[PDB]
Amino acid sequence: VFTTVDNINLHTQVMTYGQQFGPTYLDGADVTKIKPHNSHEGKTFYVLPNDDTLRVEAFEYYHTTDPSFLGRYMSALNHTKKWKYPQVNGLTSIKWADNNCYLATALLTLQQIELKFNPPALQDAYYRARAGEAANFCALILAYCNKTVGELGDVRETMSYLFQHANLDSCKRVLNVVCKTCGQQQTTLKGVEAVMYMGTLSYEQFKKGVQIPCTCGKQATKYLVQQESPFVMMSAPPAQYELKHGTFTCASEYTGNYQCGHYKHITSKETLYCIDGALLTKSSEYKGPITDVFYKENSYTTTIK
Ligand SMILES: C=CC(=O)Nc1ccc(C)c(C(=O)N[C@H](C)c2cccc3ccccc23)c1
Ligand SMILES: [Cl-]
Ligand SMILES: [Cl-]
Ligand SMILES: [Cl-]
Ligand SMILES: [Cl-]
Ligand SMILES: [Zn+2]
Ligand SMILES: [Zn+2]
Ligand SMILES: [Zn+2]
Ligand SMILES: [Zn+2]
User: Fold this and answer.
1) Ligand 1 and 260: CB distance under 6 A
2) Which of 13, 56, 105, 122 is most buried, by CB atoms within 10 Å?
3) How many structural domains compose the chain?
């Protein structure tokens, strides 16, 4: 048979699996204690890294040394394999199961923004997800986010974790802070901090300025001087918000109470589409509880001296 950690580098091997190889998985399902059948023969098994060659191969494919990672990934995959991934409005969604609404919203969002994942495991799975086969990609999202199946998930926290595994180095955000007393200070943010803001949904309002505390004691004004990124994510606690066709890429709708409510996805095409897992409605106007709005960007410089 063949052992692997990445399903690229295959090593030939020939008493339980757990005694010979340590924790040994097949197609999601733990076969550590279980024995070697005759149709459990010739195929490819995943193993926990137990020698240097496999640790290096594991880090090179996943970008983590965390020894739980593989087990958390296989426990997720055992469920995500059984979910349905229908095409909805030319996007791979997920049918509702095991509290996955937040994952579906993230997955739909990731198909509409420009992102390169550093870990080969994630990039490969992203491409396969975009082409309709998203089980692997969803298991990896759960593992990288330290979330298990059924656990209550936040889209902003999931996007934040995923962004930290993505090539956002070229992304730059210059902010000016204007206080009556302390005066003007400019800050350069890079990477994840350049593409994410919590406090308002409106990219327009971020450019025009928002009111934040100053250390001195007063209320100051933060405004956007310069943005170099393919997109920005604007987030705020759920609040009734109007979404206008053509002024945003997509948005997370969040209904109900902290943690135990539900997400739906709004996307701006030729009209506004609402994706609720397998279900698709459309309308020209939208007002509802929004918590995330994604916008297109390349290069922005303010006309405020
Ligand atoms: C840190 C621990 C944690 O478990 N976080 C987490 C996990 C899972 C979920 C669904 C949420 C969450 O309900 N997020 C929504 C969008 C939300 C965000 C911020 C402020 C809010 C105010 C009122 C209602 C919703 C609010 C947060
Ligand atoms: Cl890394
Ligand atoms: Cl299941
Ligand atoms: Cl759900
Ligand atoms: Cl990474
Ligand atoms: Zn990395
Ligand atoms: Zn399940
Ligand atoms: Zn849900
Ligand atoms: Zn001040």
Assistant:
1) no
2) 105
3) 3
